[PDB]
Swiss-Prot record:
Its EC number is 1.17.4.4. Its main location: endoplasmic reticulum. Partially oxidized VKORC1 forms a cysteine adduct with substrates, vitamin K 2,3-epoxide, inducing a closed conformation, juxtaposing all cysteines (S-S or SH) for unimpeded electron transfer. VKOR becomes fully oxidized with an open conformation that releases reaction products, vitamin K quinone, or hydroquinone. Cys-185 and Cys-193 are the cysteine pair that mediates transfer of reducing equivalents during catalysis. GO terms for cellular component: endoplasmic reticulum membrane. The chain crosses the membrane at residues 149-171, 223-237, 243-270, 274-295. This is Vitamin K epoxide reductase complex subunit 1-like protein 1. It comes from Takifugu rubripes (Japanese pufferfish). Residues 172-222, 271-273 are lumenal. (S)-warfarin binds at residues 222, 281. Disulfide bonds join 185-193, 274-277. Inhibited by warfarin (coumadin). Warfarin locks VKORC1 in both redox states into the closed conformation. Belongs to the VKOR family.
Length: 394
C-alpha cells in the first residue's frame, strides 16, 4: 500500500558496501547481487575487499535489506520498508554477543538509480582475543541445529548399523544355500551368526510370516527392515521438524522394544551370543537417545523470526530478536539484535501493526574464488497476521 512497493514488482539489483572496525581489526566488504521481492528471494555475493575478514561471516549476515521481504496480500499495509522508498531509510542496530563484544551498525538503505544500495558503518568493541568471534570458532551457516556431535554421531551410528545389516543379509542369503558355512562371527556353538539369522525369528521377526505367509515379499529377513530403519532415520535426521519428531519417536520406540524382544530370543530360546545383534541394540539405544535429546532441543526460549513492532515516537519501526550461532566445540553463541529504522525523507511512511519476518538463509562458497567471500541465498516472508474470515456479504 505504498508508492515504493511499485519499485519492487520485479528483479532489482543490489549493491552493499560495508566499512567495519572490530577492536582495531579494520576491514571492508562489498557484496553485489539481486533481489526478487515478489518471491522474497535474495541472491548475493560478498567479498572482503581488504584481504582477510577478521570475523566469522555468519556474524555479518544480519548486518549485510528487509525491504525485499515478500509480504502476503493482506499485509502490504504493514510493509514499512517499501514505503520509505525511493528516498530510503536509516537502519541502526546494536548486536550484543553473550560474554563477548558488541557491534554497533548504522546503515543507509536507499535507491541510487536502478540499484538498491545499502551503505553500512560498523564498529565492534569489547571482544575477546581468543573468543569465538575474533578466534573464528563459528560454523559456516545460520541454522537452528544441534552441534557437530550427535550429527556426526547419528550419521556414524546409522552407517554402522547399515553395514551390519548388509553383512547379516549376506550371511542369511548364504546359510540358505549351504548351512555348512563359517561367517566371520561364527566362532562355535553358543556363538553363531547363522544360528540367529537362519532362525525362524530371522525372517519377519518370527511373526508376520504366519499372517501373510512365508512366501510373501513382506516376510523379508530382519536385516532389510534394519537397513530401511537406519537409512530412513538418516534421511529424516537431516531434516529438523516436529513431524520428524513423531516419525523418529515411533520408530525408536519400536526399535527399542523389538531390541529387548530379539535379545530375549538370543539369551533364552536360542541360548546363543551375537555381538553384532548386541551392537545393533546399542545403536538403537543411541538413536532413542538422539530422538529424545532432539525432542527436548525443540525448545522455544531452518528460518529465524524477527519481530517488527511500530515506533511512533520515531516515525519508524523497531525490531528485536536473537541469532544463535553454533560453536564447533559444541557450545552456542547468542547474539541479541536490537534494531530501529526511520525514514530518511519527510514523506509519509507506513506505521505497521505487530508482525514478524521469517528469514531462511543458506551460505555457500564459489570454488573459483581466491578472495575471502560468502555466497548468500535468502528467502524472507512476512507473517503474524492471519487473513480474517471474509464476512462482508448479504
Amino acid at each position: 500500500m505504498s508508492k515504493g512497493e511499485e519499485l519492487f514488482t520485479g528483479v532489482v539489483p543490489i549493491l552493499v558496501e560495508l566499512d567495519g572496525d572490530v577492536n582495531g581489526h579494520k576491514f571492508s566488504v562489498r557484496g553485489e547481487g539481486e533481489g526478487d521481492a515478489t518471491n522474497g528471494k535474495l541472491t548475493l555475493k560478498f567479498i572482503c575487499t581488504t584481504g582477510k575478514l577478521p570475523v566469522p561471516w555468519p556474524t555479518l549476515v544480519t548486518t549485510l535489506v528487509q525491504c525485499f521481504s515478500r509480504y502476503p496480500d493482506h499485509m502490504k499495509r504493514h510493509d514499512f520498508f517499501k514505503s520509505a522508498m525511493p528516498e530510503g531509510y536509516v537502519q541502526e542496530r546494536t548486536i550484543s554477543f553473550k560474554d563477548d563484544g558488541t557491534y554497533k551498525t548504522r546503515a543507509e538503505v536507499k535507491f541510487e538509480g536502478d540499484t538498491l544500495v545499502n551503505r553500512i558503518e560498523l564498529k565492534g568493541i569489547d571482544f575477546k582475543e581468543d573468543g569465538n568471534i575474533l578466534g573464528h570458532k563459528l560454523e559456516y551457516n545460520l541454522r537452528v541445529s544441534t552441534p557437530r556431535w550427535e550429527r556426526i554421531a547419528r550419521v556414524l551410528v546409522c552407517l554402522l548399523g547399515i553395514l551390519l545389516s548388509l553383512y547379516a543379509f549376506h550371511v542369511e542369503r548364504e546359510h540358505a544355500r549351504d548351512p555348512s558355512y563359517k561367517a566371520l562371527c561364527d566362532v562355535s556353538s553358543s556363538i553363531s551368526c547363522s544360528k540367529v539369522f537362519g532362525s525362524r525369528w530371522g525372517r519377519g521377526f518370527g511373526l508376520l510370516g504366519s499372517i501373510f505367509g512365508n512366501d510373501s515379499a513382506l516376510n523379508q529377513p530382519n536385516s532389510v527392515y534394519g537397513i530401511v530403519f537406519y537409512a530412513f532415520q538418516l534421511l529424516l535426521g537431516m531434516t529438523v521438524s516436529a513431524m520428524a519428531a513423531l516419525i523418529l519417536m515411533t520408530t525408536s520406540i519400536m526399535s527399542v522394544v523389538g531390541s529387548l524382544y530379539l535379545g530375549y530370543i538370543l539369551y533364552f530360546v536360542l541360548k546363543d551370543l551375537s555381538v553384532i545383534c548386541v551392537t545393533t541394540y546399542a545403536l538403537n539405544f543411541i538413536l532413542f537417545v538422539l530422538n529424545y535429546k532432539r525432542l527436548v532441543y525443540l525448545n522455544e526460549a531452518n528460518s529465524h523470526n524477527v519481530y517488527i513492532t511500530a515506533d511512533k515516537q520515531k516515525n519508524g519501526i523497531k525490531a528485536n530478536f536473537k541469532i544463535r550461532h553454533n560453536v564447533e566445540d559444541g557450545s552456542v553463541q547468542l547474539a541479541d539484535h536490537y534494531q530501529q529504522n526511520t525514514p530518511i525523507g519527510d514523506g509519509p511512511v507506513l506505521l505497521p501493526d505487530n508482525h514478524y519476518l521469517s528469514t531462511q538463509s543458506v551460505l555457500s562458497k564459489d570454488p573459483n574464488e581466491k578472495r575471502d567471500h560468502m555466497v548468500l541465498l535468502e528467502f524472507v516472508t512476512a507473517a503474524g497476521i492471519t487473513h480474517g474470515m471474509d464476512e462482508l456479504y448479504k
